[PDB]
Amino acid sequence: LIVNVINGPNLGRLGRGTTHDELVALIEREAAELGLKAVVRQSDSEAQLLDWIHQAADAAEPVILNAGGLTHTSVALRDACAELSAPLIEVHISNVHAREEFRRHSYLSPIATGVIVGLGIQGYLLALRYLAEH
Amino acid sequence: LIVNVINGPNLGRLGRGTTHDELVALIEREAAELGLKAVVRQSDSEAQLLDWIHQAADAAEPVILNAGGLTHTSVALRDACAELSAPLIEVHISNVHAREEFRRHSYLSPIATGVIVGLGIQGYLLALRYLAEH
Amino acid sequence: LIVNVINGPNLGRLGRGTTHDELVALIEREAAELGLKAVVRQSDSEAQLLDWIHQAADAAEPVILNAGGLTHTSVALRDACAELSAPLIEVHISNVHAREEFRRHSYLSPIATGVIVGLGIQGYLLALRYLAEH
Amino acid sequence: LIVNVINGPNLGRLGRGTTHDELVALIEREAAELGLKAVVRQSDSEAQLLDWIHQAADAAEPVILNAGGLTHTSVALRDACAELSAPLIEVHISNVHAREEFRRHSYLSPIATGVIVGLGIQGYLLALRYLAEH
Amino acid sequence: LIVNVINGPNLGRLGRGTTHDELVALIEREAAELGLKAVVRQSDSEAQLLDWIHQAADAAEPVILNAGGLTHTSVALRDACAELSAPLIEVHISNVHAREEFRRHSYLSPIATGVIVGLGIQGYLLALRYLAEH
Amino acid sequence: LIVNVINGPNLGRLGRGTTHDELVALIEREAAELGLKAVVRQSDSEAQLLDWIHQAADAAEPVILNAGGLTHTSVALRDACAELSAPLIEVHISNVHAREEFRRHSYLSPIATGVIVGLGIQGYLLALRYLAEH
Amino acid sequence: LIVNVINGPNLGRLGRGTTHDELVALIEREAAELGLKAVVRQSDSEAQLLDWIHQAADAAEPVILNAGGLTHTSVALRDACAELSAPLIEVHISNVHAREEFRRHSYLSPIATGVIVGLGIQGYLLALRYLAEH
Amino acid sequence: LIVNVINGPNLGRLGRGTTHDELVALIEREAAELGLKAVVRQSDSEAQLLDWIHQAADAAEPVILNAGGLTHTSVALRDACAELSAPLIEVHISNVHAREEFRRHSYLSPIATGVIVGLGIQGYLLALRYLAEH
Amino acid sequence: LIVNVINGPNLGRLGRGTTHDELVALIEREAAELGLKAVVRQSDSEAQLLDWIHQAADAAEPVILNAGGLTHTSVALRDACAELSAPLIEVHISNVHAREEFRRHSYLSPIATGVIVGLGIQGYLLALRYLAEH
Amino acid sequence: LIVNVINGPNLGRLGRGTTHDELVALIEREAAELGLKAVVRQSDSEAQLLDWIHQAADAAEPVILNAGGLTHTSVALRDACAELSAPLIEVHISNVHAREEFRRHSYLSPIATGVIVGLGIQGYLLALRYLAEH
Amino acid sequence: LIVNVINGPNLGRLGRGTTHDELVALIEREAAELGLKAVVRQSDSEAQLLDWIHQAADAAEPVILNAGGLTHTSVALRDACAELSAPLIEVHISNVHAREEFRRHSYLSPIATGVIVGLGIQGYLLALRYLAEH
Amino acid sequence: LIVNVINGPNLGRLGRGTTHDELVALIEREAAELGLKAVVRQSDSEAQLLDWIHQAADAAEPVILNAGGLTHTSVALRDACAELSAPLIEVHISNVHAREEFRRHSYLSPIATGVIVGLGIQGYLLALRYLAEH
Numbered sequence A, B, C, D, E, F, G, H, I, J, K, L: 001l002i003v004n005v006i007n008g009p010n011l012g013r014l015g016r017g018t019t020h021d022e023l024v025a026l027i028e029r030e031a032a033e034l035g036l037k038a039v040v041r042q043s044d045s046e047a048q049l050l051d052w053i054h055q056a057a058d059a060a061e062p063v064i065l066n067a068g069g070l071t072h073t074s075v076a077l078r079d080a081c082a083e084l085s086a087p088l089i090e091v092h093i094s095n096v097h098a099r100e101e102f103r104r105h106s107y108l109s110p111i112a113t114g115v116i117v118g119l120g121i122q123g124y125l126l127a128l129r130y131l132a133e134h
């Protein structure tokens, strides 16, 4: 039923095409179509992201996570995500493999159920659809 | 309209859960639902895979590619895929980031539109859905 | 007399065996037995940890620090800890050397007085005992 | 006209020679002499630094940035700084090349207009003078 | 009841502060206070160290081990230590992380229960106290 | 009073914008304004550069050095520069961190007082101003 | 009873001492002496090797494999070999450790039961003898 | 007299400027002018390339080889080429040193007589001319 | 006629399945069957192993060597083994390639005639059989 | 019309077979046959080589360059060569890929039109022929 | 007056040219000529070498040390040698830089006064002469 | 009879203890005592050093070479030195192994007869004595 979509640093700057408010609206609409409720949250603060992941761990709710630059750098976020019992889908809007070498390593991928990159904002919608069939 | 799904070495051994024939049937059914025609092919021969990629290049048809172990090893396959003008979506059934370090490098990812890993056979269906909306 | 025990990200999630509140109680009891006063604080926010380290620097108070994942990643925390004049003991509950390779590097160890790993929550109590004899 | 000077973690601890309040006063005085207005801000919180960089991006204002330890570690800060359209000058008080090897890599340098290191607090004043002539 | 304390090469040269004979006396006194019997042995010969570890394996006795330079170099010692069923605590007098890079790798740490470094000879006494509570 | 500005290989090719003769004129004008005398010299010969550095060592005169490609390659030049007692400021016109990886290492930076990169020819003028206040 | 001996690229060129036909005859003779039936096959085509490995997986038959240069390069072959339930013995005629560094890594060794190198064609016969006693 | 020109994977796709059929015609014309007979063959199959190299080894005929992506990846092809007694000239149309780092390593170069890169299809003609004078 | 079997550190601990005394008995029985005399020796002391290798060098006798952890670490043992004129077969009971990365390098393999790993104690018997046919 | 052939350090020592004077004569003869004028120069001085490259840049003349050991070491020479507008062909007499690993990296190759190695002094003549057809 | 010459593993095998007994005689003769007394000792046992180094530390006597393979591998020997107050000269008979890469690193060189390699047994005599003038 | 002593960049700056003129005098005196003639030359120019090495190659005269920083950087100097038929002794005044890591690699050591480091100016005199006995 409930799916958490958690966006990390700089994702509030989307579109400055699709803005973060637009993304929320798109996700909510898709979720309803699939019979799910999407809770979409964004923060530039690692501590706030950690708190949202802790809550999803306690509730056994799935998480779709685009951690922004913290993907590549945060062991703390990995440690929190490792506690999740429900699925964790990592999403990147851009194809990180076509950019700098440092973007090709993720602390999150090894502990995620799966990873979608380079499909733009549709990545989020495809992750929802995976969770609805699972 | 037409989407090519190309599976590389050892993918004929799926299920020995879901068999390769079953996967073909699942993909075909999903494609029809989306208004697409899926052409699904599998080979253990790099040369045969190259030929199928060349044909998709000449026809300007999108490709969903699970190259199996060649993902990690074949520059020749990368070179062929670089010629494609329509989208290229790389799919892995397993989460390659939760396995050996060598599986975490792909010669294909940098030249793909995007990459889906770890979502099992649903990865193929989600890639179809991306192409139908694009 | 006064010893600061500072716990970083995810340490509030201990026990979800020993909870963080239990750990506080254990530390306080041991401190009193040794003739010390323990001030035990936890935060998921790097900025908050930095502030507590700055205060210990200004007061010339010893610090027992379990920085969680920031151990492996934060130069900022190292820089703050380098200002401490009293002893700094790094503690990890788990044996970081029996886990992923990335956990085997610490930005803090080179600037600490010493390091205790893998002795569970007793590590904290043993660090207190070192400080009481020093 | 307006230049933002942004100082990151631990820079509030300057002088505990020149204190952070003194640095602000020095910068403001130099700015006025050059016909500029300097807005000088410091934070130990990455999220707060990100917000200030976002604002400078939206206003098309130049930034002089001493990110402290985040220089070496934060992809998130790089990503925010990449959005700036006006110049970005990276400043370090110390000569990072005469210290530990890890300080010799910066996530910011590749995206900065230029970089001044090792000239102490005069680095800030020299960066102002560059911006006044540009 | 019985704890073996095993010191490797060059540890007989302690104090030429605290000498190796003094260390033995300190350990024995602490052990008695904790209700334990400490058997403290030192050798510069890897073969002799191996024999003492084999005996502790056969007797299921805990070991506190400061292997000196062999920490960094001996796979043979690791292999012997891997046979121990009771706890193994690695101790270094100095903080190996504040010295040459080569001292920051240990063949023993991954197979130890835990590791104490940089607390001087008190490290041995703290390891005894861990074993008495375990 | 006297400051030496030493330019290495290929710097005579500046402008083929600002030519090397123009740069000399700009530097001389700025120096006079600051109450300094600038001696500006350029050579493509490492031996000649070494001789000029030796002379500045013997006279205890400050040096502003843009060694061109020798920055990245010459231990001999580092060794000569290490003898200087007065300040040494390394200047690069381009932002070397936005170019090939090999340009991001300098044999000179560790032994320089400070380093200015990416501010174009103004880097030289800013280095003069540092020396006038020091 | 049945053992498959599979030789990869360039092994048909043996002796141009012992030729590949001679090797087949030697293996067959040894197999009969041990009460086994040896099926010896060679191909320069990875796809053909994969097919033979798939068949041995389906039949639960042991495999003695000299993959030639594919040893060092093929993840696809590793993936096929990982499916085998009966033993897999890797054989090299030459001592790969006395040659180029690249020959000292094998994608197959980690998944093999064991590995024999440098014993010439007797390696094959010794592998047969292992399988007869197992 | 006879020279073999062997082209590997994707070289049949030349011109989709100069097509592979055109290249054959150009080579044949140049060969005749030099008093040579050129046998030009292309395949996307490693096994087929191996067979052609084996035949050139048996006939003691020179080889001009553009192995395409296999240059960078195939130990099997190196092993076959090592058997050649007549000269082996490696040719690349593109300048592999101006592309991705992975293209700057060749398994073939160490065993070739020489290597021509970046001179386009004229590289083949220049290799013929070398063989005619040798 | 005479073959030396030399076992290094920790091999006396075999079976605490097959014990070291049992292994000796098995080897002796196999040797007699092959018309050989096996001299089997074990030591945890590198110096003692060196002496036995020196004696085999002086007598021009073949050696089957399982150096235990010294395989991975001892240049001294390599240097002694390099003096042997008769064959040297390296044996490991376990498949070192399926364990830690550090076990995948041997100082001995490059100087050995050949290497058998992962075939358990039968490895020793197979090495004897090689020497009997050679 | 005019082609510069520039030889770097130690190339004056050719033949102490073909001497440097002989090479000049061979090149001049070939050039005339092709309708070109070859200007062949050699120096052991990097500064002198730089000057000759600067002149070829100013005249928009092609360069055939064998930089000797500077190939592997000089960023200054790369920087000068990057200014050339006409083609730059790098030539090595020896096959650098069959020698020490350090010879397999060139600072020049990425900025050259193409590279010929291992064809002896004919490499120079083949480079002339490329330039005559281009 | 007294100089210790300490030879490590395998040095007793010299000449099986100059034997170890001959070397002793040569050293003793040279020492007497210089007014010194040479005590020359050899062992294959690290523990024995450590003891001899400890004694030289306690007596403040200079040491000429050829540690054989332990040069490259023993931190324990480095640690003992670091205690010496009188000079320490490292000697190798062979030129270790012309052999395998692993021989080009020494744990001893950084703590030695100096190092002589590749001058054969004369290296020992030259080291004596250094000590006589110092 | 004749020995060349060649000093590279910055060696003319010795003593600004022993000056370069003093070193020449010391060497000449020692040479005469040994029945040799020493020709001692110094230059900061690589080209000049190359010329002196070429002359020693042509005359078959031994060389004692302290190349200064070029030791670590010049392939050209290595190439010239490789031509020498008489002995080549590399000398460093300082112990390069006790300094920066980059000083621990020499392009010259592999091609030298031997190497003396860290014995100060006596290194030169000891090298002369080696050549007199050889």
Ligand SMILES: CC1(C)C(=O)[C@@H](O)[C@H](O)C[C@]1(O)C(=O)O
Pocket (backbone or CB within 6 Å): A009, A010, A011, A066, A067, A068, A069, A070, A071, A091, A092, A093, A094, A095, A096, A103, D075, D076, D079
């Ligand atoms: C571009 C984004 C949002 C980002 O912040 C980067 O640091 C990251 O490498 C990729 C990213 O998460 C994305 O493409 O979604």
Ligand SMILES: CC1(C)C(=O)[C@@H](O)[C@H](O)C[C@]1(O)C(=O)O
Pocket (backbone or CB within 6 Å): B009, B010, B011, B066, B067, B068, B069, B070, B071, B091, B092, B093, B094, B095, B096, B103, G075, G076, G079
């Ligand atoms: C398991 C598959 C099919 C494979 O062949 C592996 O080599 C590859 O690393 C991952 C893979 O492509 C997949 O999970 O789809």
Ligand SMILES: CC1(C)C(=O)[C@@H](O)[C@H](O)C[C@]1(O)C(=O)O
Pocket (backbone or CB within 6 Å): A075, A076, A079, C009, C010, C011, C066, C067, C068, C069, C070, C071, C091, C092, C093, C094, C095, C096, C103
């Ligand atoms: C498990 C803890 C708390 C942690 O957060 C990890 O990131 C770290 O590697 C180890 C750790 O600090 C610990 O074991 O105390």
Ligand SMILES: CC1(C)C(=O)[C@@H](O)[C@H](O)C[C@]1(O)C(=O)O
Pocket (backbone or CB within 6 Å): C075, C076, C079, D009, D010, D011, D066, D067, D068, D069, D070, D071, D091, D092, D093, D094, D095, D096, D103
């Ligand atoms: C010393 C400062 C402020 C810092 O925090 C360090 O992490 C950084 O490497 C250098 C630094 O930014 C500086 O010198 O300004």
Ligand SMILES: CC1(C)C(=O)[C@@H](O)[C@H](O)C[C@]1(O)C(=O)O
Pocket (backbone or CB within 6 Å): E009, E010, E011, E066, E067, E068, E069, E070, E071, E091, E092, E093, E094, E095, E096, E103, K075, K076, K079
């Ligand atoms: C200093 C000691 C004893 C030692 O022998 C070193 O090799 C090791 O790195 C650290 C050490 O074990 C210690 O500090 O106890």
Ligand SMILES: CC1(C)C(=O)[C@@H](O)[C@H](O)C[C@]1(O)C(=O)O
Pocket (backbone or CB within 6 Å): F009, F010, F011, F066, F067, F068, F069, F070, F071, F091, F092, F093, F094, F095, F096, F103, J075, J076, J079
């Ligand atoms: C471009 C310059 C002058 C140069 O020669 C390069 O080798 C160097 O990497 C940067 C440089 O010194 C500069 O930008 O001033």
Ligand SMILES: CC1(C)C(=O)[C@@H](O)[C@H](O)C[C@]1(O)C(=O)O
Pocket (backbone or CB within 6 Å): G009, G010, G011, G066, G067, G068, G069, G070, G071, G091, G092, G093, G094, G095, G096, G103, H075, H076, H079
């Ligand atoms: C020599 C062989 C057959 C081979 O093809 C090489 O690529 C490989 O490194 C070793 C090899 O498999 C062998 O020695 O059997």
Ligand SMILES: CC1(C)C(=O)[C@@H](O)[C@H](O)C[C@]1(O)C(=O)O
Pocket (backbone or CB within 6 Å): B075, B076, B079, H009, H010, H011, H066, H067, H068, H069, H070, H071, H091, H092, H093, H094, H095, H096, H103
């Ligand atoms: C472009 C070609 C043909 C190729 O297939 C690449 O994999 C290779 O790196 C270079 C290449 O062989 C060539 O430029 O001829």
Ligand SMILES: CC1(C)C(=O)[C@@H](O)[C@H](O)C[C@]1(O)C(=O)O
Pocket (backbone or CB within 6 Å): E075, E076, E079, I009, I010, I011, I066, I067, I068, I069, I070, I071, I091, I092, I093, I094, I095, I096, I103
């Ligand atoms: C397990 C043995 C005996 C050993 O001591 C390890 O150090 C080595 O990596 C492998 C080993 O020699 C063996 O498996 O025979």
Ligand SMILES: CC1(C)C(=O)[C@@H](O)[C@H](O)C[C@]1(O)C(=O)O
Pocket (backbone or CB within 6 Å): J009, J010, J011, J066, J067, J068, J069, J070, J071, J091, J092, J093, J094, J095, J096, J103, L075, L076, L079
């Ligand atoms: C042998 C030559 C001339 C040379 O000086 C080497 O440093 C270089 O690696 C190769 C070389 O340029 C050549 O083969 O032409």
Ligand SMILES: CC1(C)C(=O)[C@@H](O)[C@H](O)C[C@]1(O)C(=O)O
Pocket (backbone or CB within 6 Å): I075, I076, I079, K009, K010, K011, K066, K067, K068, K069, K070, K071, K091, K092, K093, K094, K095, K096, K103
């Ligand atoms: C050859 C010697 C004696 C040795 O034992 C090697 O391990 C070492 O690399 C060099 C050596 O010490 C020597 O040449 O004196």
Ligand SMILES: CC1(C)C(=O)[C@@H](O)[C@H](O)C[C@]1(O)C(=O)O
Pocket (backbone or CB within 6 Å): F075, F076, F079, L009, L010, L011, L066, L067, L068, L069, L070, L071, L091, L092, L093, L094, L095, L096, L103
């Ligand atoms: C100090 C010297 C002269 C030098 O120039 C350095 O570059 C080199 O690393 C060591 C040196 O050659 C020496 O100590 O003789």
Ligand code: NA
Pocket (backbone or CB within 6 Å): A002, A003, A004, A039, A061
């Ligand atoms: Na929720």
Ligand code: NA
Pocket (backbone or CB within 6 Å): A106, A107, A110
């Ligand atoms: Na990871």
Ligand code: NA
Pocket (backbone or CB within 6 Å): A119, A120, A121, A122, A123
């Ligand atoms: Na999209």
Ligand code: NA
Pocket (backbone or CB within 6 Å): B002, B003, B004, B039, B061
């Ligand atoms: Na199709």
